[PDB]
Amino acid sequence: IPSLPDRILDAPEIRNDYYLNLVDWSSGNVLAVALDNSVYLWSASSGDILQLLQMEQPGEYISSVAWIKEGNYLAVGTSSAEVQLWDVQQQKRLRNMTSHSARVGSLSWNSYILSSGSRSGHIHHHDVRVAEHHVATLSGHSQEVCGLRWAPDGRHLASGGNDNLVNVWPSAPGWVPLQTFTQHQGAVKAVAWCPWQSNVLATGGGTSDRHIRIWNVCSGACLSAVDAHSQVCSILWSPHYKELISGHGFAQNQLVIWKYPTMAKVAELKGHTSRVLSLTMSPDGATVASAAADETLRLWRCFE
Amino acid sequence: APXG
C-alpha cells in the first residue's frame, strides 16, 4: 500500500462542515467536487476540469452531490433545500426539486429513485422521472441526516443522523425503520454497505463516539464495534481486498484501512493537515479520494 | 485553480 496519494487536487473553499457530502466518484470515472457554491467535475482519465454549475443566489452553497448509477446525471443538494438534477453530458439542470424545509446534506440513488436527507431530519424519495417527484417521506431522525446510503441490492436504505441514530429502512412501505441502532454516541455520517454481503452495514460515529460498527441489518446484531480513536466521517468497503477504509479527524487526520472480518488495522494513510470530510471510491475500486478541510482532495491508489 |  503506497504511503503517498497518487494525486492531490486543490479543493479551494471546500466547506468545512462535517455533515455535508461534497464528493462523489461516478461510474464514468468523473469526480464531482462541491466547492462552496460551485460543483466541479474532474475526469480521472483526462484530468479535464469543468465548473458544472454555480449557485445563483447569495449565501447559497452546495450541501451534497451524488451520481446516479449510470453516471450521466448528478444530483446536487443545496443549502436552499433544493435537490437539483444535472445532466452532465448536456451540462444543464434538468430539475430543481423542492420538498425539503432545510439544506439537503445527504443523497443516495436507488435506480431512478433519488433519496435526499435534510438538516430537518427528514428523508425524501424522489422519482426523478415524474412531475411530482416527492413520492415518500421517511421520518426517523430529529436532527440532520448526514449519512444516506442505499444498499447495492436495493433491499434496504441506511441513514445516519446528528441525533446519533442509524435507521435501516425498507425499500417499500408504512414508512417505519426495520432497524434503529442507537449505540453510536455521536453523529453518524459514515454509512457503507458491504458489497459482498447484502445485509452487512458499516457505520461510523463522530468525535463523541469514534467507533466503527458493523451490523447485520436482518438480525439487528452488531457484529463488531471498533474504536478508531477519532471521528469517523466516512467508510468505504473494497470489494476486491475484503477490507474497509475509514476517514478521520483529530488528531492524525488519516485514513485507516482495516482487514475484514478481523477488523485488524492494515495501514494508515497520513498526509492531510486538517480533518477528513469525505471519502469516495473510484469505479474500479482501486482509488479512494479523500476530501479534507485542508482544501485538498487526496487520491490514494490504496486498493491496487 | 479549483481541482488543479
Please identify, in words, the CATH class of the domain defined by A7-11+18-300.
Answer: mainly beta
C-alpha dihedral (A45, A108, A253, A248), degrees to nearest 10: -140
- Technique used to solve these coordinates: X-ray
> Which of A7, A9, A48 has the highest number of chain B CBs within 10 A, making it the mutation to test binding with B?
A9
Question: Is the Cβ–Cβ distance between A128 and A95 less than 8 Å?
Answer: yes
Chain B: residue whose CA lies nearest to A7: B4
Alpha helices for A25-148 (secondary structure H): none
Which of A283, A278, A239 minimizes the C-alpha distance to A255?
Answer: A278
Q: How far is residue A181's CA from residue A160's CA, in Å, rounded to a whole number?
A: 9
Which of A112, A221, A107, A217 minimizes the C-alpha distance to A170?
Answer: A217
Would you state the cell numbers that stand for residue A195, as one nine-digit string?
458489497
Task: Name, in order, each residue with C-beta under 8 angstroms of A208's C-beta and a sequence gap of 6 or more.
Answer: A185, A186
Task: Name, in order, each residue with C-beta under 8 angstroms of A201's C-beta and a sequence gap of 6 or more.
Answer: A151, A156, A158, A166, A168, A191, A192, A193, A194, A214, A215, A216, A217
Which of A236, A241, A164, A249 minimizes the C-alpha distance to A201?
Answer: A236
Distance from CA of B2 to the nearest CA of A (A): 6
Q: Contacts of residue A299 in chain B, CB cutoff 8 Å?
A: none
